[PDB]
């Protein structure tokens, strides 16, 4: 039941980010608040920004030159090649940097969920790693809902969720 540490889930469809669970009362996948209006919104603004940044080309279509206007032809060509290399450079660089930043953004966002959950569960977690959080108590569907929202008020759980303390 490995998470982002190894890869994504094909069983989660309403997600970009979310959780997978197994508990005494259920099993399945669901998206949460870090996708909805967060990763989705960050990306929407980025997508619109990239699109908005280009100026629709209501410009010269092309020009013809005479036999004795070779320097003018070459100046025009230099200008077109210059602008073309600059815009190819900028377009590809913008995409490469934005793609690296987007993928880094997404890795950061799944890690942020991991840190969010760790902050509430480490106090009573059995094992943290491979994208999974194990507990020192058994969970029901209510446990899972609290962790997903960020309402896992661990002091109400950590008293029972203490098997490693009992054994040491």
């Amino acid at each position, epitope marked *: 039941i490995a998470g982002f540490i190894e890869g994504g889930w094909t069983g989660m469809v309403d997600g970009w980010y979310g959780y997978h669970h197994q508990n005494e009362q259920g099993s399945g996948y669901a998206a949460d608040q870090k996708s*909805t209006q967060n990763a*989705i919104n960050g990306i*929407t603004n980025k*997508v*619109n920004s990239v699109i908005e940044k280009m100026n629709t080309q209501f410009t010269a279509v092309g020009k013809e030159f005479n036999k004795l206007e070779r320097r003018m032809e070459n100046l025009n060509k230099k200008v077109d090649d210059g602008f073309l290399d600059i815009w190819t450079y900028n377009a590809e660089l913008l995409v490469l940097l934005e793609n690296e930043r987007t993928l880094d953004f997404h890795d950061s966002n799944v890690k942020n969920l991991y840190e969010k959950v760790k902050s509430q569960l480490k106090n009573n977690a059995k094992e943290i790693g491979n994208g999974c959080f194990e507990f020192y108590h058994k969970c029901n569907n209510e446990c899972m809902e609290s962790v997903k*929202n960020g309402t896992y008020d661990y002091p109400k759980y950590s008293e029972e969720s203490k098997l490693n303390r009992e054994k040491i």
Partner: antibody, heavy 127, light 113 residues
Framework: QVQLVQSGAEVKKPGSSVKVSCKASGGTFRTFGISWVRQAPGQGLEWMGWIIPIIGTPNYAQKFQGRVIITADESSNTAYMELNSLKSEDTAVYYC?????????????????????WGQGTMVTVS | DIVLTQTPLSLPVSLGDQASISCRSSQSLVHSDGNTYLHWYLQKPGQSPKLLIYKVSNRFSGVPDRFSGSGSGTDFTLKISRVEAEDLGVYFCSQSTHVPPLTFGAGTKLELK
């Protein structure tokens, strides 16, 4: 973008269909959230469907899932719908509306936000 | 399923009067985002249902400051600090927290004196 323009129709007989469309002015049509809403005379407004034109498939209102086709053309900057198997139910006016943030849809439970631009036109009569 | 019903009101108002209308929902309008997706629209005969309020407490750019609002959960209201000649028509509620949006409902009709 700031304006949605839409046209009506002559009498459509039962067993036929009604075609409705709207053109959006301005830019970035492709990421606009365009929805269709209808109103029978004397009635309130109800949903037909929702499109984000270059991002994904439409989501249709449940009463219309087996009745309508709602599509879009990102080139023509126009949203379209065709209402099939017409039963000449009260029709009157259909409306094209653009939402506010228009966040990219990947998740349909993402909020549908506010309708900032709401056009007028599309008066359709049926037999 | 997505229903927020307008209370019909036999309430003509004079110009200079204050007025308000309200809706009651079968389910909360509070989305997991923490936002409440309530909107108010006003339709005059022959017109589109123009947006007046875009958040429960925030009047939009297309309407004068006389219009505002409030509410929580399933209980919402539109408030008009002064009814002017521009105020005549049917008001609708809208919920944008679900795929099927709110049916706008019957609408509340405001009449003048």
């Amino acid at each position: 973008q700031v304006q949605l323009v839409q046209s009506g129709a002559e009498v459509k007989k039962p067993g036929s269909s009604v075609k409705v469309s709207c053109k959006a002015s301005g830019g970035t049509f492709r990421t606009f959230g365009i929805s269709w809403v209808r109103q029978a005379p004397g009635q309130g407004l109800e949903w037909m469907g929702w499109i984000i034109p270059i991002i994904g498939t439409p989501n249709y209102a449940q009463k219309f899932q087996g009745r309508v086709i709602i599509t879009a053309d990102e080139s023509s900057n126009t949203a379209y719908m065709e209402l099939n198997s017409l039963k000449s139910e009260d029709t009157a006016v259909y409306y094209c509306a653009k939402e506010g943030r228009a966040l990219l849809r990947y998740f349909d439970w993402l909020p549908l936000d506010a309708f900032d631009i709401w056009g007028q036109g599309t008066m359709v009569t049926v037999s | 399923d997505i229903v927020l019903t307008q209370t019909p009101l036999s309430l003509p108002v004079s110009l200079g009067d204050q007025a308000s209308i309200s809706c009651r929902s079968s389910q909360s309008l509070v989305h997991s985002d923490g936002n409440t997706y309530l909107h108010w629209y006003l339709q005059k005969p022959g017109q589109s249902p123009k947006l007046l309020i875009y958040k429960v407490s925030n009047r939009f750019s297309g309407v004068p400051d006389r219009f505002s609002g409030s509410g929580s959960g399933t209980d919402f209201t539109l408030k008009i600090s002064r009814v002017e000649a521009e105020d005549l028509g049917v008001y609708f509620c809208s919920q944008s927290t679900h795929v099927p949006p709110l049916t706008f409902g019957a609408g509340t009709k405001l009449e003048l004196k």
